[PDB]
């Protein structure tokens, strides 16, 4: 196991997010952490990277403390994470060729003719070799998300975190991003963490599902044992039904007192 979130609990000043949740992911596997909108699915990956510190709890980085090394030591662990974001996380003041080689000019010591042979072939893994001298503002929504995948494999990481991928896109580019995770899991040997909410496509590539409901952990089954779970909260996050544990209708607010008078 890479990260061991035992008793982590995140609570803001107004509304709390996590209260005694538990996450477990092994190495070389794909684990999808699904959940509805409204809850802090973006802030779940921030605790692994160490950008914010939790109130009560710890993240065990395979025998190493995450929020206890904030003095010139978190940067040595952050070089092998390469967190991928939902929107375009690449810079707009340069071309897309300098975005992929951006961790290669400050961390690795590679010459200039050797850098052109290790970055141009990284774009062939995502299929963007011909689009190398193009501006990031000229790319589309699905094309700019694939440029951040070549930047994620620029330092050979061990735990890639996909913060809401292939959401709000066409099914042409949605079938591309689901295939690139399976090609980078077996041929490279990395761990992918997906926190998307799209049900009928993330279960075909993942090996562990973690459905969040009532801001707690209610499901910890696999990709095949999740559909046979007799739970009212787990099955409501499946194929579309309106009624369930959460109500789509607002409760009784004295409808007879404001309709006729």
């Amino acid at each position: 196991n890479l990260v061991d979130m035992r008793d982590v609990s995140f609570t803001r000043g107004n509304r709390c997010i996590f209260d005694n949740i538990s996450l477990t992911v092994p190495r070389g596997k794909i684990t999808a952490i699904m959940g509805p909108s409204g809850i802090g699915k973006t802030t779940l990956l921030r605790l692994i990277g160490g950008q914010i510190a939790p109130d009560h709890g710890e993240i065990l980085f395979d025998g190493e403390n995450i929020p206890a090394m904030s003095r010139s030591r978190l940067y040595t662990v952050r070089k092998r994470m390469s967190m991928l974001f939902q929107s375009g996380a690449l810079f707009t003041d340069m071309n897309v060729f300098d975005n992929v080689a951006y961790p290669l000019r400050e961390h690795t010591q590679l010459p200039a003719p050797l850098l052109h042979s290790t970055v141009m072939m990284k774009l062939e893994a995502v299929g963007l070799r011909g689009a190398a001298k193009l501006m990031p503002s000229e790319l589309s929504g699905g094309m700019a998300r694939r440029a951040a995948l070549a930047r994620a494999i620029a330092l050979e990481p061990d735990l890639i975190m996909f913060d809401e991928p292939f959401v709000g896109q066409d099914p042409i580019t949605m079938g591309v991003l689901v295939k690139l995770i399976s090609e980078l899991n077996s041929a490279l040997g990395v761990t992918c963490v997906v926190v998307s909410h799209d049900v009928p496509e993330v279960l075909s590539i993942a090996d562990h599902a973690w459905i969040l409901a009532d801001k707690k952990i209610v499901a910890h089954g696999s990709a095949q044992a999740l559909q046979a779970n007799p739970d009212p909260r787990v099955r409501q996050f499946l194929d579309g039904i309106a009624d369930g544990p959460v109500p789509f209708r607002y409760p009784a607010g004295d409808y007879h007192a404001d309709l006729l008078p």
Binding site: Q51, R78, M81, Q86, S87, A89, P103, H107
Partner: protein, 259 residues
């Protein structure tokens, strides 16, 4: 009324102390680190083009107009004492004392100060500073450290162009339109032969009004709501906070140097 009226004041008293808390902590962790001179050497020329070169289309073309209205309005008011000799006296003395680092500060914060907030605030909306924080590179040294130094040394370099466009801008009404060329106009301009007055005090006010503008321009862009409305809200509040920082401190800087 002793507990209900003081309940809303506590919410606006703690957050005002935390407003200046993150403003001084961001600027402190940008220069006390490791000193690199060759790494930010291409980064400083890139930020100097946006702040200092693109701001020449507002200060130069309008600095002649401020120098022109100081000759027209400064001529009919002195028709009974000195209409030609003291024409170039009130132009060069006012532009080098209070019109130099104050009037050009509103034009510097309107183009190079308001867009500096929207430049940092756009990176937090599409998560550009968070991706740079995920590497081993300091995010407070790539978008803050070369951008703060590109605004400190830019406004004294832009003030002298505003001065030279104001003195020469007042010369079109001096040597022309019923005036003398150099007999009575330029002879009354070198009355301040001392190097302390109008040269050091003009340069002192240009450095102080350059740090206080670029500090709020980099604070509202770094602390904003990551949405479409949070960037436009911090752009409006930058011009209001910078205008009170160059006018409220103008009375402070004058009381010890001109009194």
């Amino acid at each position: 009324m002793l507990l209900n009226a003081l309940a809303s004041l506590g919410h606006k008293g703690i957050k005002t102390l935390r407003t200046f808390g993150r403003a001084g902590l961001m600027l402190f962790n940008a220069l006390v680190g490791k000193p690199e001179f060759r790494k930010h050497a291409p980064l400083l020329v890139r930020q100097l083009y946006n702040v200092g070169v693109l701001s020449m289309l507002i200060i130069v073309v309008s600095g002649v107009f401020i120098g022109m209205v100081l000759g027209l309005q400064g001529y009919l008011v002195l028709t009974t004492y000195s209409a030609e000799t003291s024409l170039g006296m009130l132009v060069a003395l006012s532009l080098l004392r209070e019109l130099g680092p104050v009037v050009a500060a509103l034009l510097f914060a309107g183009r190079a100060g308001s867009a500096l907030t929207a430049e940092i605030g756009l990176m937090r909306a599409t998560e550009q500073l968070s991706s740079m924080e995920m590497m081993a590179v300091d995010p407070l040294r790539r978008v803050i450290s070369p951008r703060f130094w590109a605004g400190v040394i830019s406004l004294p370099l832009l003030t002298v162009i505003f001065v030279a466009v104001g003195i020469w801008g007042g010369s079109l009404v001096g040597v022309s339109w019923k005036g003398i060329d150099s007999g009575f106009f330029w002879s009354a301009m070198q009355n301040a032969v001392d190097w302390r007055m109008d040269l050091v005090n003009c340069l002192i006010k240009s450095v102080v009004f350059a740090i206080t503008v670029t500090w709020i321009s980099l604070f509202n862009g770094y602390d904003a709501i990551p949405t479409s409305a949070g960037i436009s809200r911090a752009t409006t509040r930058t011009v209001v906070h910078s205008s009170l920082a160059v006018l409220g401190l103008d009375f402070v800087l004058t009381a010890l140097m001109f009194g």
